[model samples]
Target: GHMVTRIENLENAKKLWDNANSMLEKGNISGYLKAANELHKFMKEKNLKEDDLRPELSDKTISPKGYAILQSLWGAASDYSRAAATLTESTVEPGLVSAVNKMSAFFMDCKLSPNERATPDPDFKVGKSKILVGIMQFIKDVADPTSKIWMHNTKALMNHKIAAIQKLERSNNVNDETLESVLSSKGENLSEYLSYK
Candidate 1:
């Protein structure tokens, strides 16, 4: 008798909570949701986004890990772009791979750590669309016929860089050391970057 009574009471409480949650979702003009909104405002004011709390990207909703990877790629790309920017002529230029290689060597010598970066797969249909479009656009608009050597080198660098990027992006856990290794390995294969023509 006693056990049956307790079960009845528990069921009643569960029903009450379910009703309340349903009402909340239905935009019930009630105090329960109003208080929740207040708390959300407080969080935004504090800039308490999920990333600040979970650096490992453990938070499933926010994807802390994905952001970290993208940031790593972007940061490394930025360095390479800065180096490329230093070029006055349309000649062979060092992209981020060079910095990555140099940095990797330094880290190896010092017994230090490398960066970790993960990007969406290059061959992933949706992921590569934007990148492919951008590449096609640049090839069409920016290919210079003058200074044949410089132009050829520029295209080779871009080709390798893109291929390497696609390769890197395919990796789910793209660490600094791995990225450097990939770049160096790819650089060694000059034939792979050559134009079909």
Candidate 2:
């Protein structure tokens, strides 16, 4: 029951994703360390190996179940993306920034794509929504006891915010069309791509 929920909930699975996405947005040591801690605990409890989630990751890096893989990949990608942004700002460092960007891009362009080409089957089957769930779990776990109540409070606020937005949208009577596209049919693949910018 609860055991199955824990596995299906993919607490560790999603934490890896949230941590990865956070790396993309910005470098937060607290978030990284906390997520790493939680992920490690979860993985250890399950006796899961880091390579079980990501074969490319080395044991030297934090196994963190999937955390090492996600964090490493995200850090590389974000640094490259940031370098590109910096290059747009300063032509003087374009060469340096471009070099940094190239290294970052190399992981995805050179490593991941090739790996995917060689073996297309992904390991997990949890998508972006599950990642969102993991992010929420991290937030709740780290909040101060006094502030912890805000977890439920914040969701209440979101419920209201959505209701208000829906009211307005309904009043407009716009044809809120269903946006469509081919999703990364593999759930884990979608989770990984959604983590990217």
Candidate 3:
């Protein structure tokens, strides 16, 4: 009886996994995201760990091959979660940032394994490599100094600094650029003068 129950649970987990992949193939981002969460919930309910899918790679010291599979699983889940957030009324930036963070953590975790000495399956290696490249590209865009979003943030910071400097000048009875030496001495410390008020 317990064996049958276990088999059923496994079947159900596979169903959710398949449903998520199918939804993704059909470009139903929201549906895919829903199914992905369902799959994760099912796994949690069954107490299924990463090793359940690959028994050989049970520990961190095992072949990096398992990391590739795990990355695909967790990365796709993160991707779907981000996609779902993008469709909702809530802000998407946090979701996107969280997804990237998950990917980065996965990469660092897998780096503990010494895969450099072992040859990996070509297709398996390529798939994981693609995901890593895509993630790095996204990280680049988010952190790029010349990117519009980044530049906007930098502009806002500068505006605040300028306002602080102006306030300092007004109270000190000094001219604009009067503290050029101080400003140049320590970048962005103009706010220190504003703190006097």
Q: How close is each model in CA RMSD to the real structure?
A: 19.9, 16.6, 16.7
Ten residues in sequence with the least summed lDDT for candidate 3: 147-156
Segments of candidate 3 deviating more than 4 angstroms:
53-197
Candidate 1, residues 71-164, lDDT tens digits: the string is 3334453444344443333223443233333322321221112353333334323233222323322432344533122234445545655566
Residue pairs clashing, model 2: none
lDDT of each: 0.36, 0.35, 0.41
Model 3: residue 192 alpha-carbon error in angstroms: 31
TM of each candidate vs. truth: 0.28, 0.25, 0.32
Number of the top-ranking candidate, with TM-score as the measure: 3
lDDT of model 2 at position 26: 47
lDDT per residue for candidate 3 within 1-197, as digits (tens), equals 97778667766655555565455445333344455556665766787633343322233232345334444645543543443242222243335436554433323232333234433333454242233333333433344243222113322333343454456556874332443321222223334321211
lDDT score of residue 195 within candidate 1: 45
Ranking by lDDT: 3, 1, 2
**Candidate closer to the true structure by lDDT (higher is better), 1 or 2:** 1
Comparing candidate 1 with candidate 3, which one achieves the higher TM-score?
3
TM-score order of candidates, best first? 3, 1, 2
